[PDB]
Enzyme design. Structure first.
Site, PDB file in Angstrom:
ATOM      1  N   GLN A 175     -53.031 -51.751 -69.921  1.00 27.63           N
ATOM      2  CA  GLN A 175     -53.234 -50.962 -71.144  1.00 27.63           C
ATOM      3  C   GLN A 175     -54.462 -51.462 -71.879  1.00 27.63           C
ATOM      4  O   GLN A 175     -55.314 -50.657 -72.320  1.00 27.63           O
ATOM      5  CB  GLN A 175     -51.980 -50.930 -72.024  1.00 27.63           C
ATOM      6  CG  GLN A 175     -50.932 -49.953 -71.500  1.00 27.63           C
ATOM      7  CD  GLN A 175     -49.713 -49.827 -72.395  1.00 27.63           C
ATOM      8  OE1 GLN A 175     -49.347 -50.760 -73.105  1.00 27.63           O
ATOM      9  NE2 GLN A 175     -49.073 -48.664 -72.357  1.00 27.63           N
ATOM     10  N   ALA A 193     -40.506 -55.636 -62.668  1.00 28.99           N
ATOM     11  CA  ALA A 193     -40.113 -56.978 -63.124  1.00 28.99           C
ATOM     12  C   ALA A 193     -38.888 -56.941 -64.039  1.00 28.99           C
ATOM     13  O   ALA A 193     -38.157 -57.926 -64.121  1.00 28.99           O
ATOM     14  CB  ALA A 193     -41.267 -57.670 -63.840  1.00 28.99           C
ATOM     15  N   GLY A 206     -43.771 -60.417 -71.451  1.00 29.57           N
ATOM     16  CA  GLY A 206     -43.591 -59.427 -70.384  1.00 29.57           C
ATOM     17  C   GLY A 206     -43.044 -60.020 -69.096  1.00 29.57           C
ATOM     18  O   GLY A 206     -43.197 -61.216 -68.838  1.00 29.57           O
ATOM     19  N   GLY A 207     -42.405 -59.172 -68.290  1.00 30.95           N
ATOM     20  CA  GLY A 207     -41.809 -59.590 -67.019  1.00 30.95           C
ATOM     21  C   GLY A 207     -42.841 -59.889 -65.947  1.00 30.95           C
ATOM     22  O   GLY A 207     -42.908 -61.008 -65.435  1.00 30.95           O
ATOM     23  N   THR A 208     -43.630 -58.874 -65.602  1.00 30.81           N
ATOM     24  CA  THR A 208     -44.725 -59.007 -64.635  1.00 30.81           C
ATOM     25  C   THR A 208     -45.818 -59.950 -65.143  1.00 30.81           C
ATOM     26  O   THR A 208     -46.343 -60.762 -64.382  1.00 30.81           O
ATOM     27  CB  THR A 208     -45.359 -57.635 -64.316  1.00 30.81           C
ATOM     28  OG1 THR A 208     -44.340 -56.718 -63.898  1.00 30.81           O
ATOM     29  CG2 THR A 208     -46.418 -57.751 -63.217  1.00 30.81           C
ATOM     30  N   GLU A 268     -37.504 -62.389 -74.750  1.00 32.72           N
ATOM     31  CA  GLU A 268     -38.871 -62.937 -74.812  1.00 32.72           C
ATOM     32  C   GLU A 268     -39.008 -64.435 -74.924  1.00 32.72           C
ATOM     33  O   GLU A 268     -39.987 -64.974 -74.391  1.00 32.72           O
ATOM     34  CB  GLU A 268     -39.679 -62.285 -75.951  1.00 32.72           C
ATOM     35  CG  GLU A 268     -40.091 -60.843 -75.689  1.00 32.72           C
ATOM     36  CD  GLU A 268     -41.049 -60.283 -76.735  1.00 32.72           C
ATOM     37  OE1 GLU A 268     -41.254 -60.922 -77.791  1.00 32.72           O
ATOM     38  OE2 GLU A 268     -41.605 -59.188 -76.500  1.00 32.72           O
ATOM     39  N   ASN A 326     -49.270 -59.532 -82.059  1.00 31.67           N
ATOM     40  CA  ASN A 326     -49.320 -58.139 -82.468  1.00 31.67           C
ATOM     41  C   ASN A 326     -49.109 -58.001 -83.958  1.00 31.67           C
ATOM     42  O   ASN A 326     -49.759 -57.156 -84.573  1.00 31.67           O
ATOM     43  CB  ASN A 326     -48.262 -57.300 -81.734  1.00 31.67           C
ATOM     44  CG  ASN A 326     -48.550 -57.148 -80.250  1.00 31.67           C
ATOM     45  OD1 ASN A 326     -49.687 -57.299 -79.799  1.00 31.67           O
ATOM     46  ND2 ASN A 326     -47.515 -56.829 -79.481  1.00 31.67           N
ATOM     47  N   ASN A 385     -55.772 -52.159 -78.995  1.00 36.25           N
ATOM     48  CA  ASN A 385     -56.494 -52.335 -77.741  1.00 36.25           C
ATOM     49  C   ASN A 385     -57.996 -52.362 -77.992  1.00 36.25           C
ATOM     50  O   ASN A 385     -58.704 -53.227 -77.459  1.00 36.25           O
ATOM     51  CB  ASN A 385     -56.168 -51.224 -76.725  1.00 36.25           C
ATOM     52  CG  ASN A 385     -54.736 -51.278 -76.202  1.00 36.25           C
ATOM     53  OD1 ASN A 385     -54.047 -50.258 -76.183  1.00 36.25           O
ATOM     54  ND2 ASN A 385     -54.290 -52.447 -75.748  1.00 36.25           N
ATOM     55  N   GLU A 388     -70.312 -73.638 -70.613  1.00 37.52           N
ATOM     56  CA  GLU A 388     -70.804 -74.303 -71.824  1.00 37.52           C
ATOM     57  C   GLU A 388     -69.732 -74.286 -72.908  1.00 37.52           C
ATOM     58  O   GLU A 388     -69.461 -75.306 -73.556  1.00 37.52           O
ATOM     59  CB  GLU A 388     -72.061 -73.615 -72.384  1.00 37.52           C
ATOM     60  CG  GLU A 388     -73.351 -73.891 -71.626  1.00 37.52           C
ATOM     61  CD  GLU A 388     -74.585 -73.278 -72.276  1.00 37.52           C
ATOM     62  OE1 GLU A 388     -74.506 -72.803 -73.430  1.00 37.52           O
ATOM     63  OE2 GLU A 388     -75.652 -73.282 -71.627  1.00 37.52           O
TER      64      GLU A 388
HETATM   65  N1  GTP Z   1     -51.359 -55.613 -78.119  1.00 32.14           N
HETATM   66  C1  GTP Z   1     -50.652 -54.929 -77.184  1.00 32.14           C
HETATM   67  N2  GTP Z   1     -49.448 -55.432 -76.791  1.00 32.14           N
HETATM   68  C2  GTP Z   1     -48.689 -54.798 -75.859  1.00 32.14           C
HETATM   69  C3  GTP Z   1     -49.195 -53.545 -75.275  1.00 32.14           C
HETATM   70  N3  GTP Z   1     -48.262 -53.138 -74.399  1.00 32.14           N
HETATM   71  C4  GTP Z   1     -47.249 -54.039 -74.410  1.00 32.14           C
HETATM   72  N4  GTP Z   1     -47.505 -55.029 -75.287  1.00 32.14           N
HETATM   73  C5  GTP Z   1     -46.626 -56.194 -75.568  1.00 32.14           C
HETATM   74  O1  GTP Z   1     -46.167 -56.777 -74.342  1.00 32.14           O
HETATM   75  C6  GTP Z   1     -44.747 -56.958 -74.345  1.00 32.14           C
HETATM   76  C7  GTP Z   1     -44.111 -56.119 -73.241  1.00 32.14           C
HETATM   77  O2  GTP Z   1     -44.664 -56.494 -71.980  1.00 32.14           O
HETATM   78  P1  GTP Z   1     -44.969 -55.452 -70.787  1.00 32.14           P
HETATM   79  O3  GTP Z   1     -46.418 -55.640 -70.395  1.00 32.14           O
HETATM   80  O4  GTP Z   1     -44.466 -54.074 -71.146  1.00 32.14           O
HETATM   81  O5  GTP Z   1     -44.011 -56.022 -69.626  1.00 32.14           O
HETATM   82  P2  GTP Z   1     -44.497 -56.158 -68.100  1.00 32.14           P
HETATM   83  O6  GTP Z   1     -44.979 -57.573 -67.896  1.00 32.14           O
HETATM   84  O7  GTP Z   1     -45.406 -55.004 -67.753  1.00 32.14           O
HETATM   85  O8  GTP Z   1     -43.119 -55.982 -67.286  1.00 32.14           O
HETATM   86  P3  GTP Z   1     -42.483 -54.530 -66.995  1.00 32.14           P
HETATM   87  O9  GTP Z   1     -42.530 -53.816 -68.325  1.00 32.14           O
HETATM   88  O10 GTP Z   1     -41.084 -54.850 -66.525  1.00 32.14           O
HETATM   89  O11 GTP Z   1     -43.368 -53.934 -65.927  1.00 32.14           O
HETATM   90  C8  GTP Z   1     -44.241 -56.548 -75.720  1.00 32.14           C
HETATM   91  O12 GTP Z   1     -43.865 -57.705 -76.479  1.00 32.14           O
HETATM   92  C9  GTP Z   1     -45.391 -55.793 -76.365  1.00 32.14           C
HETATM   93  O13 GTP Z   1     -45.540 -56.119 -77.752  1.00 32.14           O
HETATM   94  C10 GTP Z   1     -50.517 -53.060 -75.751  1.00 32.14           C
HETATM   95  O14 GTP Z   1     -51.012 -52.004 -75.305  1.00 32.14           O
HETATM   96  N5  GTP Z   1     -51.166 -53.783 -76.682  1.00 32.14           N
END
Ligand code: GTP
Ligand code: G2P
Ligand code: GTP
Ligand code: MG
Ligand code: MG
Ligand code: MG
Lengths: 426, 428, 428
Positions: free
Chosen positions: B15, B90, B134-136, B174, B197, B219, B245
């Protein structure tokens, strides 16, 4: 990729499915023949999860319909989108349970199940990678309870690594359909403890309440109820079928809201619910959506949620929303209700957002909660069972199918234990 | 001649990455087609005659987030070899990403990485975008990180991680995720930057005057920051700051390599007309507690080192003055052993602005990456959160099911605890 | 090079301030847009290329009075960072402004002030417009004043306060408000100028020949007076009077720093043709009991010091004569210890006139700020008023509710009483 075959059982479950399927078709844009008429392109990229693309562009529902009598299958064909279903997948017997779980689970259902156990396999083979099975039935009678229960445990032998959903309808004290509810419930729940991953406990007494006051409907029917219930189902699996800013599939949800092995019973909820009068004057914004959602009387489970604390809490929002608006509201709610959330699991909230809304409505909220207030639902049942079982009443129907009086107390004990698990952490 | 390889892990990484890519495209005057109607050689390789493909690898275990890119406007920019896709997700779990599912996909990607990496000659270092929660972004990253020390080792690595918030957090499990994934980060990752965030949200509300932000606004903000790191490579200012550096400068010890970022100015289109953007003011903005990228307290903290990177209309004459002023002030304070604590970068190229962007078009911009004892306090509450969750074995059975042994938890918590004291030791 | 920071507190401050701003704009040839089609550098800072933003901070606890400026003609002159807004109002109470509500807003503004103050290099001094009888203008000002002695101290401060009238006053609880807010004024404020609405009204009626005046006519009048203080800074006359210089001149003792103003000539457009404006006549006008800005008696009073400031067509040759004449007269009289008691300022720039203004366009103008024993008698009746109100504990419970302890009242009255004798002591 990532398919879910649907199972149905019982007089009510089948009915629910009939409506649910229709609603899902409407959402994607499938017609009675099966040919696609929709305009939005994203409906066709995840069509595969609930529809096999057959010859000539005519999509078909990945489903299994089960019953111990042929009566309910008549009205399903004649109704809307009965022609979309495949003739092969309908399974039905000529005997019938007769509102008895003993007849349903051992003698009557076990003769019918071997047809379904072959039919499901084919379905499984058909898809690339099946991720889980949805199941829809009742615990009140013998047909939907005994059969479904029998089935669900035998799936765990072949497919131990798949997620298992169950959408049930437990009995109410006031709106009592049958006399032997306590019995059936007591025995049917036992197997749903160890075999299931998540279960949504719906109750009609609450639905009625929801209907009379909120929707202001003068003449409710079962159709309305079906429509309502189906909405919830649609809500939970929205992230798979459409893209989103923050996607949340079933497995993730399961991981988040089921902290312990034996405590996984949930309570569904839906918003916004508006009448013809409240459609105009209610300002549909996120905060509004939120507050309504956490009301005790807005739930689908007929209990008092505020007697105890929520162990976990998750939500699935639909339509485009600002995230600072969304994520703050939950926090605010938590802050407000510091006595109604568990303290030793800080940050109980889970959120999910979809870009494609329901047709007509701008936004929607599906509330799945896990609470200690499910004790009130079970406690009453237990009491009723005790009242019944003391005098050995209505017993010769169950004992006639080869069930000892100990076998009641084996399940009863288990039920009691389960009940206690909520009062351990309250 | 110089080159760098970008990696994107999880949904969050994907993203974030898209926005960054867009920004990059805007910078060098390249439409989505990939044919320009030099400086860009780092991130883009010119295929044959007028086809600019990015140095990129998107990993994801779902198809949804990756297929979003394949169907949109930037369909022409990438090809299916670059975009890797799993089957089972994940599911917001570290154990699913690392042990069970992580074996199959990583193999595919390593070869791909090699193919991309051996093509370029001047490898500066890696970039890995993900989230700890996040999981992944936790389970795979850890694996991936582990893998990358075998093939390269000394070649540098960076990661811009989405740190979890104590108040506004969008997932229940988390705490666990963070604690586990930091075990690999300490050994392997050379320097990891951290953003929250919640912090961003406040900034979005107060300064930009948009009370309805979504991820697309965050983003964009992130992308600017990212650019401000790599802007020294792609453009020739009077004074330059390469990645090596930077590493040499900002990171003092083996244990501590967790600086935090900040960006200024960030203001509305109408606010730019009134507000006379001076250099001193912008410098001040970087040291304000309101404009920080993480939920922290600069008043309690002490800056060991911090690297300023100016781009636009800047010269050293007033920069020096600005530096001096900060030194003079006692609200900002440093550790006794570091008398001189800044690294100053300059660039002629002005920072670009996206079509229909929330940020205003400005002359100057700053980015300070500060290593400090302020972020040491951030994990004290995380630990507490984690501990409570663990104390009654909550959510543990799922983890156990995926092949996680019980001692792993013990290992990761104790280590974390040990680390918290290190900061204290350094700052005494 | 020189600079000064204006502050506006309460509704009254806001209301006054707008007119002043307008006047300033008129003076330097700047339309509401902020781009001029040097001298103005003091109050206006040129942002980028042709955007003149004022040195200003408007504080208010309601949104109504501040949003009046945001929607009107001068929407382009300010931006939301400069204009601070509360939620709950002061409600014509000192206790609400200082203790309960005052904690949250002041914090926001101090940072803003710093941002504005550190931008300019040559800080002359502060200006703080308010009313003693007002809620926000008493409770917040006191807090604000207290705060400002920490950061600056020696850097000068001025305040043009709306003093309450014994007869024509538009609020019941005003007596209380005055008594409390003067406790902070004695310690912190360097010199406070005082004006009474009743006095103004008479002037408006008699000389201007407009029997239906409203606040907009008073505001304009005030603005001219204000200008006459700062006119020495912004324009280069033959002889100049800076703020520090003025302070040195007019204020003799630590306790006494309450001079009163006066302005002349103020006459209609038709009256200007007949009336030959001489220097002597205008000088006389400043010493007349009819033209004073406060309800007082110059016949009982004695001038310790008084600073004349001429602007327009003036030279020292006849000024001296004028000075002498006043000295010669015995109706005007001074204290024995001060033989020479005037400070005389000159300016070439003529005083401007507002489009559709009540005042006539004139060559000359005068402003005398006189420190005297006439204003000593003004608080003797205020005290009496206050005392009666207090004697039966009238209106006290409200104050108590907001966190005001009962001894506070005792402290403020006794102090006031003590002060009244000081004047007597000096004048013996
Ligand atoms: N700043 C920002 N944070 C994000 C965004 N998308 C997800 N997050 C954060 O990331 C966390 C969720 O992680 P994900 O990336 O959805 O999880 P993943 O590792 O992809 O694992 P799966 O969802 O199971 O595929 C949350 O706490 C969100 O606040 C984004 O576009 N911008
Ligand atoms: N939401 C709905 N609930 C229903 C509907 N019909 C029945 N019910 C509820 O379900 C309960 C009865 O369920 P069933 O008729 O399916 C009992 P079952 O089929 O398992 O056995 P048999 O009736 O002997 O075949 C009863 O308590 C009703 O309140 C319906 O159309 N919609
Ligand atoms: N000369 C003049 N006096 C004013 C003006 N507005 C208010 N006043 C006087 O100030 C007093 C009222 O003070 P306000 O400024 O309304 O009170 P405040 O401090 O804003 O407190 P709140 O009204 O509670 O917000 C009255 O005695 C008025 O005579 C004005 O425009 N010109
Ligand atoms: Mg039936
Ligand atoms: Mg994901
Ligand atoms: Mg007011």
């Amino acid at each position: 990729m990532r398919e879910i075959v649907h199972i149905q059982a019982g007089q009510c479950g089948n009915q629910i499915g009939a409506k649910f399927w229709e609603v899902i078709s409407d959402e994607h844009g499938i017609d009675p023949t099966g040919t696609y008429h929709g305009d939005s392109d994203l409906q066709l990229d995840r069509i595969s999860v609930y529809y096999n693309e057959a010859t000539g562009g005519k999509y078909v529902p990945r489903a299994i319909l089960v019953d111990l009598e042929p009566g309910t299958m008549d009205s399903v064909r004649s109704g809307p989108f009965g022609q979309i279903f495949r003739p092969d997948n309908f399974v039905f017997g000529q005997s019938g349970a007769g509102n008895n779980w003993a007849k349903g689970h051992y003698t009557e259902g076990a003769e019918l199940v071997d047809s379904v156990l072959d039919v499901v396999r084919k379905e499984a083979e058909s898809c690339d990678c099946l991720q889980g099975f949805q199941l829809t039935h009742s615990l009140g009678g013998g047909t939907g309870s005994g059969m479904g229960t029998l089935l669900i445990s035998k799936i765990r032998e072949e497919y131990p690594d798949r997620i298992m959903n169950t959408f049930s309808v437990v009995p109410s004290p006031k709106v009592s359909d049958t006399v032997v509810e306590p019995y059936n419930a007591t025995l049917s729940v036992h197997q749903l403890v160890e075999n299931t991953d998540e279960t949504y406990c719906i109750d009609n007494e609450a639905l009625y309440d929801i209907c009379f006051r909120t929707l202001k409907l003068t003449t409710p029917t079962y159709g309305d109820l079906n429509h309502l219930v189906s909405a919830t189902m649609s809500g939970v699996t929205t992230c798979l079928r459409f893209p989103g800013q923050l996607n949340a599939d079933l497995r993730k949800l399961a991981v988040n809201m089921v902290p312990f092995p034996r405590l996984h019973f949930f309570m569904p909820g839906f918003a916004p619910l508006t009448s013809r009068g409240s459609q105009q004057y209610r300002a549909l914004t996120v905060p509004e959506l939120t507050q309504q959602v956490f009301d005790a009387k807005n739930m689908m489970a007929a209990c008092d949620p505020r007697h105890g604390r929520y162990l976990t809490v998750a939500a699935v929002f639909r339509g485009r929303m600002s995230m600072k608006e969304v994520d703050e509201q939950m926090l605010n709610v938590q802050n407000k209700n510091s006595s109604y959330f568990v303290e030793w699991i800080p940050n109980n909230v889970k959120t999910a957002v979809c870009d494609i809304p329901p047709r007509g409505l701008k936004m929607a909220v599906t509330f799945i909660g896990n609470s200690t207030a499910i004790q009130e639902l079970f406690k009453r049942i237990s009491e009723q069972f005790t009242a019944m079982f003391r005098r050995k009443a209505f017993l010769h129907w169950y004992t006639g199918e080869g069930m000892d009086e100990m076998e009641f107390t084996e399940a009863e004990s288990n039920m009691n234990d389960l009940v206690s698990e909520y009062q351990q952490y309250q | 001649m110089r080159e760098c390889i970008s990696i994107h892990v999880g949904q969050a990484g994907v993203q974030i990455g898209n926005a960054c890519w867009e920004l990059y495209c805007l910078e060098h005057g390249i439409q989505p087609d990939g044919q320009m109607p030099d400086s860009f050689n780092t991130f883009f390789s010119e295929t044959g005659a007028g086809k600019h493909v990015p140095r990129a690898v998107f990993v994801d275990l779902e198809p949804t987030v990756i297929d979003e890119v394949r169907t949109g406007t930037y369909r022409q920019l990438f090809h299916p070899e670059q975009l890797i896709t799993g089957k089972e997700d994940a599911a917001n779990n570290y154990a699913r990403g690392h042990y069970t599912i992580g074996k199959e996909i990583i193999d595919l990607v390593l070869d791909r990485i090699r193919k991309l990496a051996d093509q370029c000659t001047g490898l500066q270092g890696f970039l890995v975008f993900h989230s700890f929660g996040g999981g992944t972004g936790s389970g795979f990253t850890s694996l991936l990180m582990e893998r990358l020390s075998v093939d390269y080792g000394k070649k540098s690595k960076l990661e811009f991680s989405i740190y979890p918030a104590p108040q506004v957090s969008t997932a229940v499990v988390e705490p666990y995720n963070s604690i586990l994934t930091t075990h690999t980060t300490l050994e392997h990752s050379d320097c990891a930057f951290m953003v929250d965030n919640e912090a961003i949200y406040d900034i979005c509300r107060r300064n930009l005057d948009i009370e309805r932000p979504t991820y697309t606004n965050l983003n964009r903000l992130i992308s600017q920051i990212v650019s401000s790191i790599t802007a020294s490579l792609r453009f020739d200012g009077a004074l330059n700051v390469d990645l090596t550096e930077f590493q040499t400068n900002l990171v003092p010890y083996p244990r501590i390599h967790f600086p935090l970022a900040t960006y200024a100015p960030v203001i509305s289109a109408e606010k730019a007309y009134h507000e006379q953007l001076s250099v001193a003011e912008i410098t001040n903005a970087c040291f304000e507690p309101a404009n920080q990228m993480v939920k922290c307290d600069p008043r309690h903290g002490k800056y060991m080192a911090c690297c300023l990177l100016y781009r636009g209309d800047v010269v050293p004459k007033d920069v020096n003055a600005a530096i001096a002023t900060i030194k003079t002030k006692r609200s900002i304070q440093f550790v006794d052993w570091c008398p001189t604590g800044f690294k100053v970068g300059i660039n002629y190229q002005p920072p670009t602005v996206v079509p229909g962007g929330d940020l205003a078009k400005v002359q100057r911009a700053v980015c300070m990456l500060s290593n400090t004892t302020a972020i040491a306090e951030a994990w004290a509450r995380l630990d507490h959160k984690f501990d409570l969750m663990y104390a009654k074995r909550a959510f543990v059975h799922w983890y156990v099911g995926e092949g996680m042994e019980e001692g792993e938890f013990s290992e990761a918590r104790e280590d974390m605890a040990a680390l918290e004291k290190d900061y204290e030791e350094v700052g005494v």
